[PDB]
Amino acid sequence: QGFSALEPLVDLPIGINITRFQTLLALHRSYLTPGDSSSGWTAGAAAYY
């Protein structure tokens, strides 16, 4: 809970009417099996909101 004290770091204008939003998990697993994000192939248990 704590508190929030958010501070600006990058404030550069772009000028695009954005409608979508997606993020890259950058997941990866063993090199032996090239899953290519088909099933599993994650080897990670993190989270985001």
Place this chain on the structure above:
Amino acid sequence: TWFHAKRFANPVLPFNDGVYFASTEKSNIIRGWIFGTTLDSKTQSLLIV
């Protein structure tokens, strides 16, 4: 919304006049924050990595 990274969690979300993000992680898993009006070659799409 909880978007844990165990399974595949990469849903495209509307940019509802602003957005918030947080992520608890004992790693550097999350790297990408791509944006765009349609995430296509036709329209300009912001890519953050």
Place this chain on the structure above:
Amino acid sequence: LKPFERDISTEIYQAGSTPCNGVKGFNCYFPLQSYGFQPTYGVGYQPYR
């Protein structure tokens, strides 16, 4: 348009509730129009930088 925006995504215009394709069609006028600037142009039609 909202100020500070560019219509760089060229596409065939439609009248609404009437899909059309190609380069010319009924109720479908090309959004772009050129400027045939020549010295024979008078005031008002003079191109200004």
